[model samples]
Target chain A: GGGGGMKLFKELEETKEQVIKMAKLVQEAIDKATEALNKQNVELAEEVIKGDDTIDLLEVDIERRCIRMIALYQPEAGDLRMIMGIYKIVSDLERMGDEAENIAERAILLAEEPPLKPYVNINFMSEIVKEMVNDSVISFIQQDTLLAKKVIEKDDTVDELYHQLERELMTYVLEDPRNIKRAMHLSFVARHYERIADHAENVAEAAIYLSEGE
Target chain B: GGGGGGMKLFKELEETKEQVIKMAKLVQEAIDKATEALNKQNVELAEEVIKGDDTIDLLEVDIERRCIRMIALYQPEAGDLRMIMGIYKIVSDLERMGDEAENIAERAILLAEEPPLKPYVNINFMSEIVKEMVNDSVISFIQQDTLLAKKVIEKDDTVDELYHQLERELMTYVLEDPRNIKRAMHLSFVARHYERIADHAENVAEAAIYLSEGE
Candidate 1:
């Protein structure tokens, strides 16, 4: 029975699914983190920060499985590429966890004081970023290059939104000295969202590589 | 015939080392050009740095290919895998640094259109530390010296300090006048780019330790 390769394939698929699972963990973290920011919920922001450990643990497990699969099965070109791609993409996902933590930390700090403003563009930015994070995983799990490319294109728009927030907050700060600290925090949150989009774009790049097979 | 295996592995190692060397040269040039473009307000130099960015990405992809192929073909022991693994990650780290360099060049171009903003002192302070970190990390990579890697990590703290100093300096600049906000933000981002460059160098140093020890 030469089903050993089949067994490896099944295991690899499971590992790939875990990568998607890990990405969802990232998405949830972002979702809760931004929600915590919007609501100024210190307890919820702390929860989001603590939940990042799960993402970190999942990343480690997936990496271990990938290394073991590669060392044990010595997979061929395509499977090897998949393993490597997942290994690479999961690192990006883990860094997204870091960004989520940053966002949560900022939220906690922001909540220490009263609300700054409506944060309309900042909230709008998070919604689009959450979508990008979701589609990034969708593209990876489905191996959809078109969707991945869309994820990449979304980054540009996120960047523009980030700068808009930056300019708006800067104008406030320039208008009133009292606005500097809160505006700075908001601007930093905006930048972190922009970075999350960049990380998602990295995953899309990995997805393209995984699907393209070169 | 028994020696052929060792010879092939050695040659692959040597070839990859050469590729890394060429990459270091490209990175050094990029760092210099971006810095020169900014400190001197040279728009042409800035544009040149940006245009050459695709070359960095292409080189990185090829380096990655070489690394994975070497891993698949060799199937060597843990010791040799350590070197190849370090090389694999180091290339990615350098590619990210190249991204930062491109960012700095973009900021440089933007700043070139305006007059000097506070002499770019905070930024100038960061470049020295960042460049040293990059230099030491590459050296540590070449030598596989854990001590040199440790030194690279130490430099990272100084870069971080420089980054914070830059932020405070720019914040003061922004507070002075409404007109200063835009230029201050651009410089702040450039300071971030330098800090990120140092971070990547520290990552390469960590790779050196990984090569020396286990995962």
Candidate 2:
């Protein structure tokens, strides 16, 4: 174990760099999978499915390391906050990965049939969400509570978009009558995106809480 | 500083046990307030809204300590797994406590305005949702699996079901006769109950998700 503050800080920076790398990979996969899902491309979707293992491996690795850090060092003040937030941060990221994968799985099934819609509006909403996800994590990395607050506020907007898209799909179903199955799938798509945003909101809140103590 | 494993673990356990206790208190108070709001005859529904502060205090305290333990110990695989599992479980419990409380509040507001409804079904329909909500917490705790959580979430159906039932009964009552104003209050009662149960169900589902995959 390193004794000097300078050495410890160097190690901490390296750990954070790896954390950020994992975040980038997972987020890219989410976007790619979402796009593949809407397009109903089997090959692309398979790629997404396959890439999940890497995320899972990283998830296990990240968590394994966080626990390792917590177990070994005597983190103080902000260092302590970062360590705690890391666990929650990874939790949200892993779930987001799972959800993106969920969309992909459904898309595989939907591929056999036609899409419920011409395009998936719900997944598209994440263009903003992916931003929020990355920015919020960045704020945490730089210890930026301001960015965290922005992410928290953005969560409600994401939820509204979800409900709006959901209601529209419901309207579509009502008119077609036979569109119930399709409508439900689309509703789930919206709901999953909404959930991903909610998890992001949770991470942002955790960052804020970690920064500002009780 | 030189305590055995039992003593060391207990030190941390004491804090967690406390959080669980605090979360339990929040859930209880929120349910009481929501139940009070269900009365629909009063405007006192918002009275207990601030009580959640105490749970927040405990939650912050609990998570902080757990984080400290993790950082200092750099614990091994077994302890590592348990600690991560425990952290999320506490979060899921606390979040559920919040939702269940909110649903009760929603019930009060919705009940304040009597929605149209079908004839009363003895409110027995509310039983399924209520039981599921409570059972979700217990079953998920016992099983520690997502399947149970998914099952609990599936029980959210009763919320929509009760909504439809209330609408239908009200429509039927309107058809049968006029001036069924008193019966309308019952529909709100039913709605509030369904709402609260769903919140509880959500809490259980969240926990199940967390425990099953550390998500």
Candidate 3:
């Protein structure tokens, strides 16, 4: 029984490491996606779009392992909660990957058009969202609710930045109807970053729930 | 142990049923309020939809706790495990539907001050389809009826078509006059929300299939 318990614990650790690896990949996707947008690098944007499939597969793999752990070990209380938390976190991460792909797709289209103003605000929002994603995952791995709360707090900043970008883009649209399509696409990119932050918040919330058992 | 396990599985299903039914009712209300808010240009109703999201969030948390407890206590296997897992996914999808409702309500508020841009006929149609999808998805899960679940899945394409049609219509409005840009954008967002809600409902239907067929 003790050896079996040790094996379950080992498997749980391996599953968590996979989640961490996935988080790193997602964070890279966000970084590359934003850089791709700002620099109008279709090559990088295409890479981000293509790389999302890997994240999707990783999420499915993590979920399967989590369910298997539950089935095999029948972990109770804290162990069970941790496994379920990992399951929820991976779902949020996978959606973040989707959102990153969305931003990357927009970047490719926008690269074909003339630049609409500077992408300063959008870049700023991406930086914050990427940090939130990393910090949220760190919170989960470290079992630190404080870091989780901090990640949650940053979502408001991301939201504010998104609105600021939206208002700025709207002015561009109003200035010239020609700017409408590109401006709207930029607005969507900002919205995608905002959604990534929201998913990061979801991860942080999951971390808190895992620690507090709430 | 055989009879004891059977009893535990029955209790697990009952508990999941109660929580999911409550969640479906709240989600359906959100859809209704959001649609009504847009159709009537009622900012107050939209505000209510936004405010009511907290209740839905709380219910999702409650359901998650119950599912965790059931899994830990019963250690359900095969079909029973699939049902519990499906409920976990369904609850997440339902919560996202509530989020989409909130998004629509926010857009409704944004468009409340603007003059009407055409009729919201297609938006209303999309809303009706999504609402029906949510209801049928839950009913299919409760009944464990793959047929009903498949029906829910089929309605998703119709919802997608309405979304694309509405977006095209809104684009025409935007292109016609720059003055229509902001309001049209907001309206387009409402259509997008309905589209996303239908997507989540379809996910629930897929989850229902897994529950019934263990796929």
Candidate 4:
């Protein structure tokens, strides 16, 4: 039983490492999607769209591994909680990937049209959201409840930025009704970034739960 | 170990049933938040919906904990393992449904401030489809009926079509009078939230099928 327990512990550690790797991949996806939108690089946008299937596959694979670990090791409460935390974390990461794809899809459409006021606010929102994503995973891996709380707090900033962008875009549409389609697309892009931040908050909340047993 | 194992399995099944019941209650909460609050323009109800999402999130955490505990204690395999995993997936879907409901309620608060361009007849119709999808999805999972799950999946397309129609209708209102922009955009988002809820229900149905068929 002692030897088996060590093996299960090692396996859990490896699972955490895999989740970190997936987190990096998802973070890169967000960066590329934001760049694609900012630079209006349709090719880069296409890459983000194509890369999503891989993220989806990783989520399913990681989930299976978590289930297998539980079935094989029957870990005690603490480790079992950690495994379940990883399970939920990966799902949140996959959702962030989907949101990246959504942003990229909008980027592709926007690329064909003229630029929408330089994307300064969208770029700013994405930067904050990307930081939240990184820190959420870091907090999870370190089991740092303080960092997790900070990550949760940053979602408010993202929401404020999103509402600001919505108002700005509405103004753009009002100034010239011709900007309706582009304004709507940009608004959705802001909404997507907001949602990505929400998922990051979720990841952070999971980290807090793992550390605090709450 | 045989009788003990049988009893543990029975307990696991009962736990799963209870989680499903809890999920049904949360889904009902979502339905009311997304539809009733908007239909009545009840800001207090909308605020409750927003605050109620925390409860939904906490419930997901509770269900996940219980599922992990069951798996660790019982070491369920095959059909039992699939059923537990299915519950995990269903709870996540239910949580998202609650999130969508909150989104709708927020927009409802905004839409409350202005006069109505038209009644929410079509929106109500779309909500009906979503409510049915959610109810049927839960029933399918409980009964382990793949045919009923498939029916829920089929209704997803209807929801999608209705969403598109609503989008076009709202666009007409916006274009007719730019003053309608704020209200129309909020309403459009509300419609999208309903569409998203239906999609989550579709995912639940798929999870139900996987539980029964192990696919």
Candidate 5:
């Protein structure tokens, strides 16, 4: 039924909602992982890893929804682009899970350390990234151009934060030569978190462009 | 339909080939820019970039006809896969233009008489490893094995994450060791270019996955 089947439309909305929910999973991981790292709690890191199962299940659910929608509904027009973009965007979200694991693993490592050094820049980066993830998903759901634009503009922030954190950590190493390797590992966590944010912003950009047909 | 209505196939293949080739031009320029920084030859970088712009356009004409015929004969199970593999592999071929650009920068630094006293080990490390990353990314792509392709995805991403770590390490050259600034600048070039290589490699894997019905 090219007349825009009710069944397909319902599925589309449900799928989009699920994508936003995946965004929340990412946001929660960022928050929980940061808390565990700051508190030096290995158990929290482990708990974060287990908490990720919901994200894995959600991603699989979205994947089946996407493949089924395209193969069955044969969606066309803007809906087609949105569906495909959602698929691509959601896959990117899953990759975020892997990168976040990279962070959680770092948290587990830092869990024993008596807070080697207070990570001011990394914490700042975490806050910014968590907010960006939420903003991008909301922008996608609302089809809000302003929100998407904000997401695109924040790629610069993420890159800059990466730079700032790197600089701060380098000084951290310079100050205490003993922490170089450990500092570098945490720096990696900060870098990966920034990148995961970039992926979310990219999704927002893709959606914005699709909406504009530009 | 293959009688005459297939004209679009040839045209489309030619255009896609040309697009890949044209993209190489920009990549080549980015590589050259990094190299120019190495050479400290702002002028030469600009000039060489303009001169080397044709590599991509030429590749367009080169791959056009071959790609179309490659697609036409695919026997369902295997035919299309080979050509798709070839396109996926072309990313490394396209990125060679970038490597050549960096080579030009290394040359430029020597010409400026400000070359580092010793080989920049870290930059060289990135260069050495990234070339392999490009090779593996392409080989995995051309073979269309998702597992092999997934292999470098993690490795390359780690390498990319390492880029920032390396850059921060290099910032020490700024004040205490002015002599090391040149090497530091070169490391920046290496890290940046290596990341770009990693990115293209990721694209190749994406295409391979798409063709394999996994994406």
Candidate 6:
């Protein structure tokens, strides 16, 4: 806002805020979808599935707006990298929404049947992922490299928990042939949450890049 | 081949072309190895896939740096700029395709420890089709053939159909016996890797088309 070249400052700030809001929207879908699965609430699962479209629309909007701004401003390398970081971070966020939709789809398929055991492990892993996803955005906006680092470190825990859930579900299937489909679906659910964590880690890495230029 | 440009610009284009061709060949080789390892449950083959990724990554870094430098030096026209941008993005997609292969190999190594639930997820048909798409995309980029890129785009549906068909067939095994659950999950992951690889190829094809059209 200092020089004659302060034209894109307000626009870029607005876009950044909108990007964070979109991330919040996606994280909400992820949380509700997992909760719906845990509680076997078909209605909520359906809602999460439908909510994905908004995320997709926002993704396209942010991508176009960022690209247009870059073309118009033609900023130098450091600023260009910052815009590009946001560009790539939104793709990760959008894909996380897709992963959430996939989970909700499984929830829909599983809702008709009896609940698959208790949701202790699934619940635990998903909660951590949601937290990481939220912080990834906040850190990006705040330019807090430490917060981003925390998100990256937390991914290991998320992955380890996913493995434990997978093993336990496998044991369940092994014990009862009737449990195969249910256990497989739950294993997939576990895998989806793990992927969500990976996406969050990607966002965190983008945040670090934008902040530290690394 | 240039009206006014120096030898350095042409040299840049040639070097970029050579780098991507090498990347294309390397990625194709990675896919073949991973698919072979998955098909044969060969842990050693899978390990090689994991080890080979560092080479693909190094190649991406070099290509990206060169593209950035060329853009700065050339101050290229829209067509050349679009082509350079496409080159950068395609390099990224190639690296990601390599990542998918590594993931498939990891799945292979895991499945090798456990008895595979046969009849093997037989993604060979899917792999061959995806491999062809990757080749077409690379060729389209080299030849500036938008028509070939469109053909690559059209084949995506067949891959999707085969992917869902595989998913449906694998679920039956999971429903049949609990013992098949582990192998089925592994196969599902393998299918997922190939599906994603197809997606990266589609992106690369789109990039090729964009550069060809200069849009």
State which candidate has the highest DockQ.
3
Label model 4 with its docking quality class.
Answer: acceptable
Q: Which residue segments of model 5 deviate by more than 4 Å?
A: A1-4, A50-64, A153-164, B1-14, B21-118, B125-129, B132-196, B199-203, B206-215
Candidate 3 local lDDT, A1-214, one digit each (tens): 5558887899999999999999999998999998888888999998998899999899889989988998888886888888888988899999999999999999999998778788889888988998999999999877789999999999999988888986887678777777777887887788899889999999998888777764
**Which structure is stronger by DockQ: 2 or 5?**
2
DockQ of 3: 0.57
B82-155 per-residue lDDT for model 1 (tens digits): 67756776888888888899999999999988887878776777877787777778778867788999999998
> Candidate 3: which pairs clash?
none
Angstrom error at residue B123, model 1: 1.5
Q: A122-185, model 6: which lDDT tens digit per residue?
A: 8999889999999998888778899999999999999899889878877887777677668878
In order, the first chain's TM-score in every candidate is 0.96, 0.89, 0.97, 0.97, 0.92, 0.95
- What is the number of residue pairs that collide in model 6? 0
lDDT of 3 by residue, B1-215 (tens): 24587787687688777889999999999999999998888999999999999999988888887888788777788777777777887889899999999999988888888777888889988998999999999899877789999999999999988888987787678778878878887887888789889988988887778677764
Worst lDDT window (10 residues) for model 5 chain B? B72-81
Clashing pairs in 4: none
TM-score of 6: 0.87
- By lDDT, who's the top model here? 3
Question: Candidate 4 chain B, which ten residues in sequence have the lowest lDDT sum?
Answer: B1-10
Whole-model lDDT values for every prediction: 0.83, 0.62, 0.87, 0.85, 0.64, 0.83
- Candidate 3, which segments miss by more than 4 Å at Cα? B1-5
RMSD of 6: 3.3
Give each candidate's fraction of reference contacts reproduced: 0.18, 0.09, 0.55, 0.32, 0.00, 0.41
Span of 10 residues, lowest total lDDT, candidate 3 chain B: B1-10
User: A58-109 in candidate 4: lDDT tens per residue?
Assistant: 8988898988888788888788888878988898999999999999999988
Ranking by lDDT: 3, 4, 1, 6, 5, 2
Q: Regarding TM-score, does 5 or 6 come out ahead?
A: 6
Encode model 6's per-residue lDDT on B1-215: one tens digit a residue.
55656567778988898999999888888899998888888998999999998899899879977876775566555566566666866887888899898899999999888766775645888889888888898999877899999999888878888889997897788778656777888898888888888988988888787677765
Full candidate order by TM-score, most accurate first: 3, 1, 4, 6, 5, 2
Q: Per-residue lDDT tens digits of candidate 5, residues A75-95?
A: 555666566567657766775
